[PDB]
Amino acid sequence: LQNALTQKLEEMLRQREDLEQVRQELYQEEQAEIYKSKLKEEAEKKLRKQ
Amino acid sequence: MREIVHLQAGQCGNQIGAKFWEVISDEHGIDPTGTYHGDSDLQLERINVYYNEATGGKYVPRAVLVDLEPGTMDSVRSGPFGQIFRPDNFVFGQSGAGNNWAKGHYTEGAELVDSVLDVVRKEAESCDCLQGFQLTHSLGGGTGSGMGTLLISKIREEYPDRIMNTFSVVPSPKVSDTVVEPYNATLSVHQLVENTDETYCIDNEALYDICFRTLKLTTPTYGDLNHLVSATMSGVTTCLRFPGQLNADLRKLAVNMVPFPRLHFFMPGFAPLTSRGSQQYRALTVPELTQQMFDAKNMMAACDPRHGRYLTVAAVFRGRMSMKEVDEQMLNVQNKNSSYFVEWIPNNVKTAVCDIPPRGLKMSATFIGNSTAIQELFKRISEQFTAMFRRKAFLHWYTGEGMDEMEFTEAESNMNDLVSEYQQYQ
Amino acid sequence: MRECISIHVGQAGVQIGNACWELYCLEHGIQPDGQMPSDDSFNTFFSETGAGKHVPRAVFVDLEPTVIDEVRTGTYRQLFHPEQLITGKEDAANNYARGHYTIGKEIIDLVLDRIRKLADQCTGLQGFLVFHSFGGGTGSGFTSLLMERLSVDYGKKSKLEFSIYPAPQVSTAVVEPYNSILTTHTTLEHSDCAFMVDNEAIYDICRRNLDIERPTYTNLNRLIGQIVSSITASLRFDGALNVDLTEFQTNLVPYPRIHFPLATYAPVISAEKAYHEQLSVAEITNACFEPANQMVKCDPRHGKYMACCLLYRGDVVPKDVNAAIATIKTKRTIQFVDWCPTGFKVGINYQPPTVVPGGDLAKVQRAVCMLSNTTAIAEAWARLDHKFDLMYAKRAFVHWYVGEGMEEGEFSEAREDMAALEKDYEEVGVDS
Amino acid sequence: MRECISIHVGQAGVQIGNACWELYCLEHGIQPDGQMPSDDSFNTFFSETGAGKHVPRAVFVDLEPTVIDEVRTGTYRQLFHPEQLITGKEDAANNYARGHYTIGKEIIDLVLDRIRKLADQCTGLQGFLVFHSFGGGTGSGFTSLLMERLSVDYGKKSKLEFSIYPAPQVSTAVVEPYNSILTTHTTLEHSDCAFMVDNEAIYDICRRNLDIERPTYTNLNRLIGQIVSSITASLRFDGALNVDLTEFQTNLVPYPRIHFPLATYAPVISAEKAYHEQLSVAEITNACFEPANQMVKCDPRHGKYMACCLLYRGDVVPKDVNAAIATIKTKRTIQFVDWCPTGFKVGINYQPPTVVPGGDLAKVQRAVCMLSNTTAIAEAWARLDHKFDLMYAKRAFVHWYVGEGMEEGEFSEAREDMAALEKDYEEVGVDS
Amino acid sequence: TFQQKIKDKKESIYLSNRRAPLGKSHDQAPGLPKGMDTTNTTFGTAVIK
Numbered sequence A: 001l002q003n004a005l006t007q008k009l010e011e012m013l014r015q016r017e018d019l020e021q022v023r024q025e026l027y028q029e030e031q032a033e034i035y036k037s038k039l040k041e042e043a044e045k046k047l048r049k050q
Numbered sequence B: 001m002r003e004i005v006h007l008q009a010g011q012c013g014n015q016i017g018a019k020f021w022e023v024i025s026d027e028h029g030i031d032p033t034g035t036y037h038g039d040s041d042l043q044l045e046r047i048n049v050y051y052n053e054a055t056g057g058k059y060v061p062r063a064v065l066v067d068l069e070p071g072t073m074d075s076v077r078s079g080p081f082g083q084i085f086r087p088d089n090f091v092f093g094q095s096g097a098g099n100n101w102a103k104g105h106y107t108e109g110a111e112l113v114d115s116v117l118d119v120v121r122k123e124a125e126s127c128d129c130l131q132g133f134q135l136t137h138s139l140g141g142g143t144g145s146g147m148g149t150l151l152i153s154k155i156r157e158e159y160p161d162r163i164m165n166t167f168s169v170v171p172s173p174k175v176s177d178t179v180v181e182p183y184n185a186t187l188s189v190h191q192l193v194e195n196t197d198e199t200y201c202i203d204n205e206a207l208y209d210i211c212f213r214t215l216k217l218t219t220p221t222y223g224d225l226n227h228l229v230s231a232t233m234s235g236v237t238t239c240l241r242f243p244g245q246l247n248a249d250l251r252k253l254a255v256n257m258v259p260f261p262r263l264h265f266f267m268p269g270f271a272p273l274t275s276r277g278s279q280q281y282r283a284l285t286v287p288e289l290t291q292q293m294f295d296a297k298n299m300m301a302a303c304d305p306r307h308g309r310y311l312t313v314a315a316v317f318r319g320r321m322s323m324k325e326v327d328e329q330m331l332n333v334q335n336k337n338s339s340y341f342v343e344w345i346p347n348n349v350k351t352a353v354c355d356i357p358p359r360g361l362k363m364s365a366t367f368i369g370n371s372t373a374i375q376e377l378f379k380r381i382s383e384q385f386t387a388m389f390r391r392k393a394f395l396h397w398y399t400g401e402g403m404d405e406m407e408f409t410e411a412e413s414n415m416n417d418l419v420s421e422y423q424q425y426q
Numbered sequence C, D: 001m002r003e004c005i006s007i008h009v010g011q012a013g014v015q016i017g018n019a020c021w022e023l024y025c026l027e028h029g030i031q032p033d034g035q036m037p038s039d040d041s042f043n044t045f046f047s048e049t050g051a052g053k054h055v056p057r058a059v060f061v062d063l064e065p066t067v068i069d070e071v072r073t074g075t076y077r078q079l080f081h082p083e084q085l086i087t088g089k090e091d092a093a094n095n096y097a098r099g100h101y102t103i104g105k106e107i108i109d110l111v112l113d114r115i116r117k118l119a120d121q122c123t124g125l126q127g128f129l130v131f132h133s134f135g136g137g138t139g140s141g142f143t144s145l146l147m148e149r150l151s152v153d154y155g156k157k158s159k160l161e162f163s164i165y166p167a168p169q170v171s172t173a174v175v176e177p178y179n180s181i182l183t184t185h186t187t188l189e190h191s192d193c194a195f196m197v198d199n200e201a202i203y204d205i206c207r208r209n210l211d212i213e214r215p216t217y218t219n220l221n222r223l224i225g226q227i228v229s230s231i232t233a234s235l236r237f238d239g240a241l242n243v244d245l246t247e248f249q250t251n252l253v254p255y256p257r258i259h260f261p262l263a264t265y266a267p268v269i270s271a272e273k274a275y276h277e278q279l280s281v282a283e284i285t286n287a288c289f290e291p292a293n294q295m296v297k298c299d300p301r302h303g304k305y306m307a308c309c310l311l312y313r314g315d316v317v318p319k320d321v322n323a324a325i326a327t328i329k330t331k332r333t334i335q336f337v338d339w340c341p342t343g344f345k346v347g348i349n350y351q352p353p354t355v356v357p358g359g360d361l362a363k364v365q366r367a368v369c370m371l372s373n374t375t376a377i378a379e380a381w382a383r384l385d386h387k388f389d390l391m392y393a394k395r396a397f398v399h400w401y402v403g404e405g406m407e408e409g410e411f412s413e414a415r416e417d418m419a420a421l422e423k424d425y426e427e428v429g430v431d432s
Numbered sequence E: 001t002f003q004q005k006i007k008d009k010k011e012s013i014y015l016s017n018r019r020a021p022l023g024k025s026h027d028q029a030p031g032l033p034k035g036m037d038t039t040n041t042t043f044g045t046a047v048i049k
Ligand SMILES: Nc1nc2c(ncn2[C@@H]2O[C@H](COP(=O)(O)OP(=O)(O)OP(=O)(O)O)[C@@H](O)[C@H]2O)c(=O)[nH]1
Pocket: B245, B246, C010, C011, C012, C013, C015, C016, C091, C092, C093, C094, C095, C133, C134, C135, C136, C137, C138, C139, C140, C164, C171, C172, C173, C199, C217, C220, C221
């Protein structure tokens, strides 16, 4: 019985940690694409001004 | 349950404050229309701290925008997140203050603040249990400092057992964008000493130098400077809205940093500012942030902490880190560096950790420090005011609006009292 | 029949309490919903609803909602009673004069009425288990008037106070020496026995024995939760000789002032180490009295021992205990006072220690928990009065405590009692 | 052979009757249509027509038509008698003399004609159940001249009265201190038992126990509807120890001028909390005596109890009742008068409580209704004569009364009676 | 009525709308176990002879 309870509690904690990890993980590539767009905008603005 | 009221006054206050609402709405998941398009159940759990409710699943900020020139808030209303505020909370005049402190306190601001506090009264009575207030201004102008210190003393009498948060930009030595800048700084700090529980010092000179030696910025416009200030404003008050292992609210930071009621001026900072030359090669560890905290370049004022001594230092962490690693790192900074801290206070260093870092960043923290090095910022203002006061230069319209000559001498005596108490406790 | 009441005030008690009730449910076979899956061992800590739900005998009280509202939405939201989770509005914020005089006075009727409702379901009461820490004003100001009311209302009931002690190098607050001297006033007169643990010694034990490079606040509460489970293991399980809460109240405390025992666990080992080591009674007894395993940062070799109580769990044969006891008094390093030859007390239990999900401790057949009362606290209290006197010579941080309702004379009144407590060790430490 | 007559006057008395006669329909299985599907347990309240319809024994009188005309349009149109719904044209308009002197004379011959007609159908009369409120002009004016025609018609019959007490702070009318004094000039003479309920105490019952933060008037009237169905339940059902309507007049009225008891119900709890609790006989009888569950805003610790009547329902047994009653007498907080060594009266029934569908009350096996006659009402009547005296020193609001037939001299005569009635609480409170 | 249902569906996210509807308590189905009809079940300890 102790083995069964330990297994189910481990599964519950693993699922909650997975949720927190994926929600924290999906942030950084958005900022990377944002600054790639910023660099393209800067180059286009310089060429347009010239 | 623990609500804060935000007030924006002056051009410097409004531009910083308008970026502040764009930063925290991204962390809470609010679209510019005002609806909740959020991703977590933890973001909406503590949202009544800064926001009031609307009709139709929308959230409005608990902010009041006040300025004597309508042209400034026309830029704010036309901005990215300008459609979130209440139009009733916009309180404006028609005749500008002219960057003259006697106008914004006696003859021009004295007719508007009847209508300013009625917005403040009905936005602060609607709370269930109010914690404190926030107000953004600068110590160089006649609008940020004229009406800014008047708004504090009217609500300090109204709400005595509360806490004031003023995030003040101090005048710089070498920038000098105003001719009468040493006058109205001394006149405004005469009221911030007696009536504010927490005052922050921010220098435009230091904010420039951070952008070059650390971020390696090419063109640091005024958008990027407010991005540095608004991140420090959010890091201070993150224990109210996010769960943490060792949390510390605003009044928790009121007791530990202020030993005597005269010294509540803090130099703040931010932990993981990094340039993209070395962003992708950087290592992120708790010992790595601690190197970047106590750097005097990372501080946002033109005071060198090695020309003084520290009283109390706190650092509010954000993310998922180990709390043993936090405290032995923050004990090592006190054991080995013993001269720069005071002797009659054991364990100068306080810590706090929350579990929610800012977006797009694994680990982050904010720095707040109390030092005796801040006397030089006050000493350089007191000597610039002394030189012009001998010849009575630029002073004859302040006297023309009902403000006597003895009022300027009273401010200088109270200003030199603050310099003496920093050296006495050194 | 026999049972105990558990109260978790402040923050530092709650995560310890969160790690304790996750430990108690696995030993008694209860899912965290609170219902047994498809025996009177749980009557010490749980109450049986006739439908089939087990309710803990716990009250969770804090002055701020940011720590309890994670339990109302957590995994254990189905376990507690909704009226047991008392919650205020604004935190005392490490100010003793807030949590005792102006903020702790608005929820004292709610917390005490839950004590009456829990003790009216009782049939025979043994004691209380109050969890707090010295540093915070919530764990110091609120505890002081909590136990002032329990002492008057309940006359001769035990009050086993579990307290975190401020370590010399590891500490968070800066007004922390001001609160701990003020915290001592309620423990010298209303507390039957208060247990002392700090954070820094647990940091090294996790760093030295567990080989954990980066310990955190969830790993410390599992080590603390084992000791609280070990003390009450003689109530829920049968053993060779069983110790009640009142049993070891007399055995450990000599005098009406010296009631601060020091907790220790053994063997505190990892999974990669105990698989090779042979562990018997004659080694885990010596590992308790080692100077490198006390869970309070103090040197026991400077002071002298006064009374000890070793509680063994698991597969322990009591002849092997006697060889371990006789070995200790032959050694010259372990020093006792000459007016106490009978200084040990033993307890054997047949229920082995349990593992927790995601934990770092190992599966070891037998484990011993030691409660030691010594004079090593004398340097640990001559330290904390120097921190208080340094900041009080210039009257630092006093204007916050004064304004809430606290006088100035009680700061000097608390210091003169700490002078009386410090000299009580040296009065009784000398051999006649 | 046992019957009761109910009269509902005003708006507060009638609107409870919408929630009162709702509840009696569920318990006996009578549809709101008035026909019973597939037993003399309903003979107290319902008289069966030979066609199959069951009609209530209640008379609905109001001067204002707008509250009865919604009953004549609703689902319960087919239940009541068309002649037992009596309406006027214009209300009393919060005036005593518009209900007793000016308009109440014209329609009272139709009112007593019905009460004469209902009594001839009954073979045994046990009492009356008049529902009204003190504050209004119809609840105060009209019931005062109804009983003085009623007492000269039926002499020895009980007249039980359920009146809404005006709350200390919250009130919805302005001349309530003027209009509540004028009721008691006759109820101290022609009424034998008048129970007290206010609105501010039930507001905090709903806020804390039921966890209802936004209550309406349908929420309160279902809680008051349970107490009346708990008091009457010894007449409709078989029990272990039944109490008649005349039976608890002698138990509760020691002096002719002290007949104002307070009703209390338990366990008033929501549906989420009760699944965690172990509701037993030894605890629901403590829920009545705590000061947070009295249905009148008064502090009972200041006064002393005189006579208590605990009426139980459901699965309760006589051992656990009187084992728990003797527990109360050992407590120092519950203070009885020394001239009543016995004050507890016990009634036990065999039927469990019945919840309405869509209600917020939980489904519990048992229930207890406590009727406490206490001396704490003197402080509740001290503050109301202080409301009368400040408004009479400047002769405010007087000229509306003199324009209808009421004199000014009876304002002095009614006030001097409250000088005597509050005095009599002290003449019986003093110990010999 | 359908547009008001749209408005109330959008407005149900509020803390005040979760904590306090009109004339009722909050939702008790998170508190109670799944699949239990509340008005049909019996709460308490049954006395058996
Ligand atoms: N073992 C353990 N100790 C903790 C934990 N959290 C805080 N502490 C300790 O508690 C001390 C301060 O007391 P706290 O309980 O955190 O604060 P408090 O008593 O709630 O007082 P307030 O913060 O003002 O509400 C710190 O020095 C920490 O060492 C924890 O989760 N586990």
